[PDB]
Structure 1
Amino acid sequence: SVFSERTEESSAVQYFQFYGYLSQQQNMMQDYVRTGTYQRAILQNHTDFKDKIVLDVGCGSGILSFFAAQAGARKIYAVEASTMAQHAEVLVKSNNLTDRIVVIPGKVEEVSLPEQVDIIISEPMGYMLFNERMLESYLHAKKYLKPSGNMFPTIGDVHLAPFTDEQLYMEQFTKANFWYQPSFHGVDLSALRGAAVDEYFRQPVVDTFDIRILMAKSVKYTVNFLEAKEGDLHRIEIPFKFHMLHSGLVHGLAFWFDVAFIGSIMTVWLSTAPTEPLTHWYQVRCLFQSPLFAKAGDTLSGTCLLIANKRQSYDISIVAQVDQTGSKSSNLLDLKNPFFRY
């Protein structure tokens, strides 16, 4: 299948094992911004659901399918590949909805659906939007979507902005300097210090921060889920030209995302921005190896290149320069192995 071809088995096993835990479902469900917004998006756009056929991609415990049911869906196919599928079945029976919600265990790339659907619902967003590569499963599911069918969410906006955080930058060196000692219990560890620094710099930092560290208005990269193909997410090139609002050292780029549910009655937004209440997605920061000095009114230009890998994540390549001085910085980061700093 399409899933198996783009995914290493060792990664898939661990991934679905993780999503098998009720504790993880509870964690997601307790995020009121997440759960409450999905409910509002679905219920306030009830005419998009009333007597319609629905597909729920990666349904977990089934919450979104129950929201679809509350909004009057005739039939809902809830697909889930983890062992959570069996717990969803239990809930469907206990809530007397066996006639309306049909749980289908398996990958959405592998299962068969009996009929085409009017609307697809899912929560395919990982850290930095793209992590987990579930957006591709969501897009793959459009083979089951009728012409003029809708998708919830309809679009996703990834936001990038440059930040200054001297303490975050310096912390990498302080940690690595453990190895810069000539007699640790009689052993000279200094030769490994450079390797430790490299290791810490490969890790994107998952944490939140005060918005006062942001040095320019964000640049937005939009994926329209109605129009996009799976293929569009294998190589994601995000050019940026930031107009600097403050002078100082730029230590890296900060990432967050919004999604929009574009219904017939209204558009509802779910934001993970640092200006908004914290979600279980937090925000993500990728450091530069060396900070770039910019003055207010300079432009900081470059590219963020995300290359999909077989571990259900991305290799991140960031190149940036201050156009006025020609000072340049790169970094290469492994999105699969983030540092949780919070």
Structure 2
Amino acid sequence: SVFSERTEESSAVQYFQFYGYLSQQQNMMQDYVRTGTYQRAILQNHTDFKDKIVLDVGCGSGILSFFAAQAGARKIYAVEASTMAQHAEVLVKSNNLTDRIVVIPGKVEEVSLPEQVDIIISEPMGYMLFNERMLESYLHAKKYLKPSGNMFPTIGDVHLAPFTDEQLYMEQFTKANFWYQPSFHGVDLSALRGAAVDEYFRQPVVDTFDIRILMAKSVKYTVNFLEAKEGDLHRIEIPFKFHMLHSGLVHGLAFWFDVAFIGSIMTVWLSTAPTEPLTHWYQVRCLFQSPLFAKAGDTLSGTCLLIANKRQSYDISIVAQVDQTGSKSSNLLDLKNPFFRYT
């Protein structure tokens, strides 16, 4: 019941319906960097799986469990709450692994596992790492992890960097200005211009971009999944101090993430950086309401505060100022209403 107490029923319904589609599973599977890196992380750390007990949190089609099986896992508990659980069972039988993979339909916060596991595996990451709040389910499942146990992924580093994108900033007002007309089919729309601007600026922009728009080395916030607690992700305060590498108008912050699989043999990384090939996580950009001018050598400092909501998302609050000028800007954004951009 930890899941249903932090999540509106209306949101859980839609969430699980979405991951219940094969088309969606196929998308995730066809991302070769994602699928291949998970496989590489598990198989190259075979000693972390050989004759071990394994929990796969939100197994979907089962693919990560099959990898754990390839690596030599004695026993794998594959938990999945969507109707995809049925399809995972089918694959476990057709691949003759009924003696090693047990699919358990339900939420990991609600099901009973019969024993403690040596290692947990999952793909719980959303946009800017935290969105969809499955990282809480992943951490929750540590109640089943032996003390010496491991987690794959082991850590997550959400990166934050300032960007310049005059054209993105301008789009907002250009769109909002639809309403700034005194006779649209004889109707004066202009009283709504302000509300339109607000709405557009509350949407985090999900797409990719040229790394040339980044104005400073990114700042890293690390969650270590071995030590973290579920509750650590209810309120996430990310302080930042950027040392500006380029002079210009900073229109917002860009977000991406890495996770690392820290095994006994080696550490394997999965990156969603804009310097790396595009994943189904893209990148995320949050605009400031007002651009901040900064010179190369200036510091831009502030806080990104993420406050978990009952729609399995975050309210994002960003405050920033150029320390050498005192010019400051903010923005409050809702990751439950992202703008998926094609410009």
Cα deviation 1:218-266 (Å, max 9, x = unaligned):
0000000000000100000000000000000000000000000000000
Cα deviation 1:173-196 (Å, max 9, x = unaligned):
000011011000000000001100
2:66 equivalent to 1:66? yes
* 1:311 matched residue in structure 2: 311
CA distance in 1, matches of 2:83, 2:180: 46
- 1:65 Cα deviation from its structure 2 partner: 0.2
Secondary structure of residue in 1 paired with 2:169: helix
Cα deviation 1:81-125 (Å, max 9, x = unaligned):
000000000000111111100000000000000000000000000
Instruction: Describe how 1:10-21 pairs up with structure 2 within 5 A.
Output: 10-21=10-21
- 1:5 Cα deviation from its structure 2 partner: 0.5
- 1:41 Cα deviation from its structure 2 partner: 0.1
CA distance in 1, matches of 2:7, 2:113: 23
CA distance in 2, matches of 1:28, 1:271: 15
For structure 2, the 5+ residue unaligned runs are none
* 2:29 matched residue in structure 1: 29
Secondary structure of residue in 2 paired with 1:238: strand
CA distance in 1, matches of 2:171, 2:114: 55
Please list every run of at least 4 consecutive aligned residues from structure 1 whose deviation after the TM superposition is greater than 2 angstroms.
none
- 1:272 Cα deviation from its structure 2 partner: 0.2
- 1:340 Cα deviation from its structure 2 partner: 0.4
Could you state the TM-score of these two structures normalised by the residue count of structure 2?
0.99
- 1:210 Cα deviation from its structure 2 partner: 0.3
Secondary structure of residue in 1 paired with 2:98: coil
- 1:25 Cα deviation from its structure 2 partner: 0.3
Cα deviation 1:34-71 (Å, max 9, x = unaligned):
00000000000000000000000000000000000000
CA distance in 2, matches of 1:30, 1:341: 22
Cα deviation 1:161-219 (Å, max 9, x = unaligned):
00000000000000001101100000000000110000000000000000000000000
- 1:141 Cα deviation from its structure 2 partner: 0.3
Could you state the TM-score of these two structures normalised by the residue count of structure 1?
1.00
Secondary structure of residue in 2 paired with 1:112: coil
- 1:22 Cα deviation from its structure 2 partner: 0.4
Cα deviation 1:3-31 (Å, max 9, x = unaligned):
00000000000100011000000000000
Secondary structure of residue in 1 paired with 2:273: coil
- 1:148 Cα deviation from its structure 2 partner: 0.6
Secondary structure of residue in 2 paired with 1:60: coil
Cα deviation 1:121-161 (Å, max 9, x = unaligned):
00000001000000000000000000110000000000000
CA distance in 2, matches of 1:150, 1:189: 58
Secondary structure of residue in 1 paired with 2:183: coil
Cα deviation 1:255-310 (Å, max 9, x = unaligned):
00000000000000000000000000000000000000000000000000000000
CA distance in 1, matches of 2:55, 2:106: 14
CA distance in 1, matches of 2:64, 2:91: 12
The sequence identity of aligned pairs, in percent, is 100
For structure 1, the 5+ residue unaligned runs are none
* 2:229 matched residue in structure 1: 229
CA distance in 1, matches of 2:54, 2:333: 38
Secondary structure of residue in 1 paired with 2:91: helix
Secondary structure of residue in 2 paired with 1:269: strand
Cα deviation 1:294-331 (Å, max 9, x = unaligned):
00000000000000000001000000000000000000
Aligned length: 342
CA distance in 1, matches of 2:289, 2:59: 40
Instruction: Describe how 1:249-260 pairs up with structure 2 within 5 A.
Output: 249-260=249-260
CA distance in 1, matches of 2:94, 2:197: 53
CA distance in 2, matches of 1:274, 1:40: 22
CA distance in 2, matches of 1:312, 1:281: 16
CA distance in 2, matches of 1:166, 1:114: 56
CA distance in 1, matches of 2:337, 2:44: 38
